[PDB]
C-alpha cells in the first residue's frame, strides 16, 4: 500500500511499511516558517534516535526492560490485535519515562564501550 | 545539573552531561535567517562527525595518535584539573590539524574495510 495505508492494520503488519512513512516526512513567510519547522522537527527526531544509539535503524532494539506498569498486555494482543494508533494512545502517559530510560542506557553503554577499547 | 551546568566542572565530570548540551542545540526575515543558520551549523557538525566515522556517537575513539606537541600534559592533569573551556583555549591553534588527520584516517579505514569485504 501507499502512505499511511497500514494505519488501520495490526502493529505487526504495519511494521513492514516503515520506509513508506519515513520517505514522506521530507517529500511567503508563512510557507518558509512551515518548512523550517518541518526540518527542525525531523532533525529533533533524528537527534533523539542518535542519543538512544539508533541513528541508522528503522527498527532498533535496546537494553531497557519493559516495566509492565506501562502495559500488561502480552505480545499476541499487542502485535496481532492492536493498531499503532491504539498503542500510541494506550501508553501516551509513559512516553517520556521510556525516553528517559533509553537515554540513560546509551550513556552507560558508551562509557562501557570506551572502557573496553582501553584494554590493551 | 541543567544546560551548561558542567561548564565549570572538570573534563571528566563534564563528559557525563553530553546529552544535555546536545539536546539544546535544536531546542521575520532576521529570525528565519537565524534559524536557517542554526540548522546549517548543526548539519555541518553532524557531517563532520560522519566524515570521521563518528556519526552515531557522543564519545568516539579513533586511530589518530596524540602528537604530544599539541599538549604535553598527562591524563591526570587534563581530565581531573582542567575544564573544557581551558582545554578548548589551550589547543585552539591545532584544531584544524587534528581534524585533517581524523579525516585521513577514516578514508584509509573505508578502503581497508571494502578490501576485506572483497575477500571470498
Amino acid at each position, epitope marked *: 500500500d501507499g502512505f499511511l495505508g497500514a494505519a488501520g492494520s495490526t502493529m505487526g503488519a504495519a511494521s513492514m511499511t516503515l520506509t513508506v512513512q519515513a520517505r514522506n516526512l521530507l517529500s511567503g513567510i508563512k510557507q518558509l516558517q512551515a518548512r523550517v519547522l518541518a526540518v527542525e522537527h525531523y532533525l529533533r527526531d533524528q537527534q533523539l534516535l542518535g542519543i538512544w544509539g539508533c541513528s541508522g535503524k528503522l527498527i532498533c532494539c535496546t537494553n531497557v526492560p519493559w516495566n509492565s506498569s506501562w502495559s500488561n498486555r502480552n505480545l499476541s494482543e499487542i502485535w496481532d490485535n492492536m493498531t499503532w494508533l491504539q498503542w500510541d494512545k494506550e501508553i501516551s502517559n509513559y512516553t517520556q519515562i521510556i525516553y528517559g530510560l533509553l537515554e540513560e542506557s546509551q550513556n*552507560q553503554q558508551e562509557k*562501557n564501550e*570506551q*572502557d573496553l*577499547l*582501553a584494554l*590493551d | 545539573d541543567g544546560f551548561l551546568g558542567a561548564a565549570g566542572s572538570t573534563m*571528566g565530570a563534564a563528559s557525563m552531561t553530553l546529552t544535555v548540551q546536545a539536546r539544546n542545540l535544536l531546542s521575520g526575515i532576521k529570525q528565519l535567517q537565524a534559524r536557517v543558520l542554526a540548522v546549517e551549523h548543526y548539519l555541518r557538525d553532524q557531517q563532520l562527525l560522519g566524515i570521521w566515522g563518528c556519526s552515531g556517537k557522543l564519545i568516539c575513539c579513533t586511530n589518530v595518535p596524540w602528537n604530544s606537541s599539541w599538549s604535553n600534559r598527562n591524563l*591526570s592533569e587534563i581530565w581531573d584539573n582542567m575544564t573544557w573551556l581551558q582545554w578548548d583555549k589551550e589547543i585552539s591553534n591545532y584544531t584544524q590539524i587534528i581534524y585533517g588527520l581524523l579525516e585521513e584516517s577514516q578514508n584509509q579505514q573505508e578502503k581497508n574495510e571494502q578490501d576485506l569485504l572483497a575477500l571470498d
Partner: antibody, heavy 123, light 106 residues
Framework: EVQLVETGGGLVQPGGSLKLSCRAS????????MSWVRQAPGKGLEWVSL????????FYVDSVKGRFTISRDNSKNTLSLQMHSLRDGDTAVYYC??????????????????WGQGALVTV | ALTQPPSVSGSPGQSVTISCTGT?????????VSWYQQHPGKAPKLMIY???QRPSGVSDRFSGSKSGNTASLTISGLQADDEADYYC???????????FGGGTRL
C-alpha cells in the same frame, strides 16, 4: 593508608554456594577497579576475577566463567563474590585487591596496587 | 603460568636476580610485568609495576628489567628481612588478563 578486609565462610561441600565480601577504606572506592586473586594452600597465586570501577564490566578466568559472579556497591564500599559449585580444585585463600584495570581517562594500571588479608575457602 | 626458578639465594649484602620467562603473547608484547613480595602467611606486597617502575615506600634495592620474553627482578644488598616468595605477573591481553609465575623462595 588503605585497609581491605575480606569476610567469608568456612567449610562448604561440593555443589554448594559460598559468598565472600571485601570491605575497603582509606581511598575513594569508586575510583578504582578491583579484582579477586586466589592462592591454593600449597601453591602460588592466580587471578580469578576483575570488576571495573563502575561495576558494569566483569571479567573471569575460563575456569570460573560459569560458577563465579563478581559485583560491587560503591555506596557501601563493598566488593562481593558469589561462587557456585565449588569443586575441590577451588580450595584457596581468596584475596581482594585494588587495581588491575583503568577506565580510559586514568593512567594505566595492569598491576594489583593494594591487597587485603584473605578469606580461606575450604571445599 | 610463567616460569621462574624454584629458588634464588646469596649472602647478605650481595645482589641476586630472580628471572621470569614467558612467551611472545605476554611478557614480549606488553610492557606490564609487575613483581610482588609475599612473606609467608601474609598477603603479597607490590614491589615492581609496569617494567621498571617502583611503588612509593619501596627502597632502591629492588629494580628490574625486560629483554625479549624474559623479565627479571634484581635485589641488591640482600638483607635478613628479604626472605619471601617472589612472584611475577604479566598482562596477557583481553582473553587472558593476568598470568602469574611459580613462586621463587629467596
Amino acid at each position: 593508608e588503605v585497609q581491605l578486609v575480606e569476610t567469608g565462610g568456612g567449610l562448604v561441600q561440593p555443589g554448594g554456594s559460598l559468598k565472600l565480601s571485601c570491605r575497603a577504606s582509606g581511598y575513594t572506592f569508586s575510583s578504582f577497579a578491583m579484582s579477586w586473586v586466589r592462592q591454593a594452600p600449597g601453591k602460588g597465586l592466580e587471578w580469578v576475577s576483575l570488576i571495573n570501577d563502575r561495576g558494569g564490566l566483569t571479567f573471569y578466568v575460563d575456569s570460573v566463567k560459569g560458577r563465579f559472579t563478581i559485583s560491587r556497591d560503591n555506596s557501601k564500599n563493598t566488593l562481593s563474590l558469589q561462587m557456585h559449585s565449588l569443586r575441590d580444585g577451588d580450595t584457596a585463600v581468596y584475596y581482594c585487591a585494588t587495581g588491575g584495570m583503568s577506565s580510559a581517562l586514568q593512567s594505566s594500571k595492569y598491576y594489583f596496587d593494594f591487597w587485603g588479608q584473605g578469606a580461606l575457602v575450604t571445599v | 603460568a610463567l616460569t621462574q626458578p624454584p629458588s634464588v639465594s646469596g649472602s647478605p649484602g650481595q645482589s641476586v636476580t630472580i628471572s621470569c620467562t614467558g612467551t611472545s603473547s605476554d611478557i614480549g608484547s606488553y610492557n606490564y610485568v609487575s613483581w610482588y613480595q609475599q612473606h609467608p602467611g601474609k598477603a603479597p606486597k607490590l614491589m615492581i609495576y609496569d617494567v621498571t617502575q617502583r611503588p612509593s615506600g619501596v627502597s632502591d634495592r629492588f629494580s628490574g628489567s625486560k629483554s625479549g620474553n624474559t623479565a627479571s627482578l634484581t635485589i641488591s644488598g640482600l638483607q635478613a628481612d628479604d626472605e619471601a616468595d617472589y612472584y611475577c605477573s604479566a598482562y596477557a591481553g583481553r582473553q587472558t588478563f593476568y598470568i602469574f609465575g611459580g613462586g621463587t623462595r629467596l
